[PDB]
Amino acid sequence: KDMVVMLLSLLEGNVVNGMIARQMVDMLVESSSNVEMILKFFDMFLKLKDIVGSEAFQDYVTDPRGLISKKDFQKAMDSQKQFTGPEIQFLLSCSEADENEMINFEEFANRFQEPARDIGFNVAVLLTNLSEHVPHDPRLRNFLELAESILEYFRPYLGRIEIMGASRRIERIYFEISETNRAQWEMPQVKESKRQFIFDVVNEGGEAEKMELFVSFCEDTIFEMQIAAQISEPFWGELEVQRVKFLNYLSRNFYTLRFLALFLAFAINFILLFYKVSDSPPNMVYYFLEESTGYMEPALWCLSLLHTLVAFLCIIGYNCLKVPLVIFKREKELARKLEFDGLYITEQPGDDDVKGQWDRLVLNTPSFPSNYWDKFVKRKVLDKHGDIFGRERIAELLGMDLASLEITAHNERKPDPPPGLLTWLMSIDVKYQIWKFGVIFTDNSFLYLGWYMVMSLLGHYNNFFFAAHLLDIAMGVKTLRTILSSVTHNGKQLVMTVGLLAVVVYLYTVVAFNFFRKFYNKSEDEDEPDMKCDDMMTCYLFHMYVGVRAGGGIGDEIEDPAGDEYELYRVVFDITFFFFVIVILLAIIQGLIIDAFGELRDQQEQVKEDMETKCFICGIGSDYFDTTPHGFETHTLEEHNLANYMFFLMYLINKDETEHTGQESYVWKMYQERCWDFFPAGDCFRKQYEDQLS
């Protein structure tokens, strides 16, 4: 593995048909027999590991102990028609058969799987690199064919990306993707987060912030993967382990609890449909269920208690599952604004940014980066700004002790961590907690869950408050959420047009009060009339209440104007009211709703077409890649896969800096400097070597 790593280092910054790569191919040909022996060693055991799991092999397996005789192995393996006679003999020799010629194939198959994995992967990477940079040497297809099983095996873990390298050219980078990372990336919650992020950027983003946003998304996704791993499941100590088990259980099943709460609310309301009010006991009235079974009254109480408990558990699961991401994002943005911008060192936001003003409480806290990974942000801020703005002033701003830095660099102290609740008491950072709780209480999802809490509790004071939980279907169902977004999309327009309607109705009210007061008698009685327009307020209520709701406007309600000196004036009044108010303005409202529907649909279509037509990384359209068949599909699956950039970032984070290669160190440095010039923009490997590849 070390020698192959040296060879791969020789291939750094290597162009297509480069002379070092051609020399490497000539070397491999010069040692063709030994290279074939190595490849046959790897593929034999890769094939063995999958043969031992075959039902055909299990048919030959007969010993109850789980062993197989050498002769049975011999007659089973040649039945597969995958090995030659000498290879079967070699496998028999490598099998640690006992004196009874019994083989433990379970350990035999797994014996070399782990030791040979890293070297197998590096051989695969080497062959892939050489094949892609010397595409016209037929002597190498033989090696690729001999390594076909190895390459197929390591295909899910061989990650490749392209960068704009140190040499002002597009370079292809090969690296490793782990099973755990891939499995976590395949989780449905992560896939939903990816779809939402892609939609946000492509819809309401510019071409300039795209890569910064993508990298921020990658960092957030890494943190979410960590949270998922933590909550995943395979007297103070006992209570603590049970508490974390319970908290993980709530976190894992947060959505099932949410659905259970909705189902319980529906059941409660269905019971509530049977309510009845009567004067007689079951001058004020009594409310009581009216059913024959006699079990609905106990069922309602049981469901109310269960629903309140489920809501509480939903609150806990949310603050154990999402709040960490909320605090992480907030700490990360605050730290980067402190360092790369000097938010509270230079500019000092002007009291109109409630977020920036609230973040001032956390700066001097001992534990400001609690969720964010960087525990040295304060040291970096001091080293960057202290000379010009005052080291002691910065230290007071960030709550640092200038004396402690030297001793911390000097040596490490190992104090006594007494596991006592009394000792844990003072250890609470109250200012940090106040800041965190303010951030949580200013979160929409948490506020909604708390409102759910409050209404569930009020349901015990009066069971009809459980009707409010029926509104949960809007957030529970993506279909309802889209439909209601089709209303909220033009909410400012709707409120403004309702206000305009109020104003126009007021103008009509003024006209009616001044001139048409006779016609607003809504009393069939002859001696006591009910005049609706002897007052501004009464007339305006009458108009906004009956005229707007009437099909034909106010003329439907007020008296006939026929045979009056003001007949024509009143008919113009009525027709204009009907047209401006009933027809035009209500048409405006309905049109705003329909236009919001169309706008949402065309946004979705635009995002989809953009994804299916341009590469998310380099921006080159599918038309260029499609010259080669399936060119865009291969480009978005292999060459410029964004999942691969995410995986590469994870890989760099995990890997030791002393072990970074040149390209990895380059990308890592430009990542830490927040410089995204390594992302290929408007250029790709295929374009750069159009001549040599074609």
Ligand X SMILES: Nc1ncnc2c1ncn2[C@@H]1O[C@H](COP(=O)(O)OP(=O)(O)OP(=O)(O)O)[C@@H](O)[C@H]1O
Ligand Y SMILES: O=c1nc2[nH][nH]cc-2c(=O)[nH]1
| 562 close to 545: Cβ distance less than 8 angstroms | no
Residue 553 binding: pick among ligand X, Ca ion, a second copy, none (C-beta 5-8 Å cut-off by kind) = a second copy
Question: Known binder of ligand: residue 639?
Answer: yes
Contacts 24+ apart (CB under 8 A), 430-439: 431/361, 431/362, 431/364, 431/365, 432/362, 432/365, 432/366, 432/367, 432/368, 432/370, 434/361, 435/358, 435/359, 435/361, 435/362, 435/365, 436/327, 438/358, 438/361, 439/326, 439/327, 439/330, 439/358
Integer Cα distance of 17 and 692 in angstroms: 8
* 116 vs 473 by CB, closer to a second copy: 473
**Minimum gap (Å) between residue 159 Cβ and ligand Y:** 17
* Residue reference for tokens 């994002």: 329
DSSP-H helix ranges across 186-283? 188-204, 210-231, 236-252, 254-272
Specify the DSSP element, H or E, that contains 287: strand 286-289
Residues that bind ligand Y in the complex, under the rule CB under 6 A = 219, 222, 373, 653
Q: Please identify which residue in 473, 607, 643, 652 interacts with a second copy, judged by CB under 8 A.
A: 473
| 536 close to 555: Cβ distance less than 8 angstroms | no
**Minimum gap (Å) between residue 661 Cβ and Ca ion:** 8
Q: Of residues 282-321, which lie at the interface with a second copy (CB under 8 A)? A: 290
Residues that bind ligand X in the complex, under the rule CB under 6 A = 611-612, 615-617, 636, 640-642
In angstroms, the Cα distances linking 352 to 74, 341, 356, 357, 393 are 81, 18, 9, 8, 24
571 belongs to the binding site for a second copy (CB under 8 A): yes
125 belongs to the binding site for Zn ion (CB under 5 A): no
5 belongs to the binding site for a second copy (CB under 8 A): no
Q: Please identify which residue in 102, 231, 615, 650 interacts with Zn ion, judged by CB under 5 A.
A: 615
* Residue reference for tokens 């030994």: 34
* 397 vs 617 by CB, closer to ligand X: 617
274 belongs to the binding site for a second copy (CB under 8 A): yes
* 83 vs 90 by CB, closer to a second copy: 83
Q: Please identify which residue in 318, 452, 540, 648 interacts with a second copy, judged by CB under 8 A.
A: 540
* 345 vs 581 by CB, closer to a second copy: 581
Token code pair at residue 505: 């109705």
607 belongs to the binding site for a second copy (CB under 8 A): no
| 27 close to 676: Cβ distance less than 8 angstroms | no
List Cβ neighbours of 621 (8 Å cut-off, separation of 6 or more). 613, 614, 615
582 belongs to the binding site for Zn ion (CB under 5 A): no
Residue 617 binding: pick among a second copy, ligand Y, Zn ion, none (C-beta 5-8 Å cut-off by kind) = Zn ion
- Of 255-263, 314-322, 370-378, 676-684, the window that binds a second copy (rule: CB under 8 A) is 676-684
Q: Taking each helix axis as running N to C, give the angle between helix 138-146 and helix 19-30, from 0 to 180 degrees, rounded to the nearest 10.
A: 60
Residue 222 binding: pick among Zn ion, ligand Y, Ca ion, none (C-beta 5-8 Å cut-off by kind) = ligand Y
**Minimum gap (Å) between residue 215 Cβ and ligand Y:** 8
Residue 21 binding: pick among a second copy, ligand Y, ligand X, none (C-beta 5-8 Å cut-off by kind) = none
| 15 close to 689: Cβ distance less than 8 angstroms | yes
- Of 7-15, 421-429, 577-585, 652-660, the window that binds Ca ion (rule: CB under 5 A) is 652-660
* 184 vs 641 by CB, closer to ligand X: 641
- Of 203-211, 219-227, 413-421, 451-459, the window that binds a second copy (rule: CB under 8 A) is 203-211
* 355 vs 608 by CB, closer to a second copy: 608
Contacts 24+ apart (CB under 8 A), 669-675: 671/215, 674/212, 674/336, 674/340
**Minimum gap (Å) between residue 400 Cβ and ligand X:** 36
User: At residue 127, what is the residue type?
Assistant: L
Question: Known binder of ligand: residue 162?
Answer: no
Question: Known binder of ligand: residue 636?
Answer: yes
**Which of 261, 251, 181 minimizes the C-alpha distance to 222?**
181
* 27 vs 653 by CB, closer to ligand Y: 653
Question: Known binder of ligand: residue 435?
Answer: no
Residue 611 binding: pick among Ca ion, ligand X, Zn ion, none (C-beta 5-8 Å cut-off by kind) = ligand X
Integer Cα distance of 25 and 17 in angstroms: 11
User: At residue 606, what is the residue type?
Assistant: Q
513 belongs to the binding site for a second copy (CB under 8 A): yes
Torsion of CA 42, 45, 51, 52, to 10 degrees: -160
**Which of 557, 551, 568, 483 minimizes the C-alpha distance to 520?**
557
Question: Known binder of ligand: residue 642?
Answer: yes
521 belongs to the binding site for a second copy (CB under 8 A): no
**Minimum gap (Å) between residue 218 Cβ and ligand Y:** 7
**Minimum gap (Å) between residue 624 Cβ and ligand X:** 13
| 160 close to 172: Cβ distance less than 8 angstroms | yes
Integer Cα distance of 622 and 636 in angstroms: 10
**Minimum gap (Å) between residue 161 Cβ and a second copy:** 17
**Minimum gap (Å) between residue 650 Cβ and ligand Y:** 8
Residue 371 binding: pick among Ca ion, ligand X, Zn ion, none (C-beta 5-8 Å cut-off by kind) = none
**Minimum gap (Å) between residue 473 Cβ and a second copy:** 7
- Output phi, psi for 205, to 5 deg: -135, 155
Q: Of residues 260-319, which lie at the interface with Ca ion (CB under 5 A)? A: none
603 belongs to the binding site for a second copy (CB under 8 A): no
Longest Cα pair distance anywhere in the chain, in angstroms? 126
170 belongs to the binding site for Zn ion (CB under 5 A): no
Q: What is the CA radius of gyration of the chain?
A: 37
617 belongs to the binding site for Zn ion (CB under 5 A): yes
**Minimum gap (Å) between residue 625 Cβ and ligand X:** 10
Question: Known binder of ligand: residue 195?
Answer: yes
* 582 vs 642 by CB, closer to ligand X: 642
* 377 vs 582 by CB, closer to a second copy: 582
637 belongs to the binding site for a second copy (CB under 8 A): no
Specify the DSSP element, H or E, that contains 160: strand 158-164
**Strand pairing class (158-164; 286-289):** unpaired
Specify the DSSP element, H or E, that contains 539: helix 536-542
| 52 close to 109: Cβ distance less than 8 angstroms | yes
Integer Cα distance of 469 and 455 in angstroms: 8
* 47 vs 640 by CB, closer to Zn ion: 640
- Of 206-214, 257-265, 412-420, 651-659, the window that binds a second copy (rule: CB under 8 A) is 206-214
Specify the DSSP element, H or E, that contains 423: helix 421-426
Q: Please identify which residue in 3, 425, 430, 562 interacts with a second copy, judged by CB under 8 A.
A: 562
Question: Known binder of ligand: residue 611?
Answer: yes
Binding residue positions for caffeine? 373
Residues of the binding site: 191-195, 373, 611-616, 636-642, 658
Annotated binding site for Ca(2+): 658
**Chain residues that interact with Ca ion, rule: CB under 5 A:** 658
- The binding site for ATP comprises 191-195, 611-616, 636-642
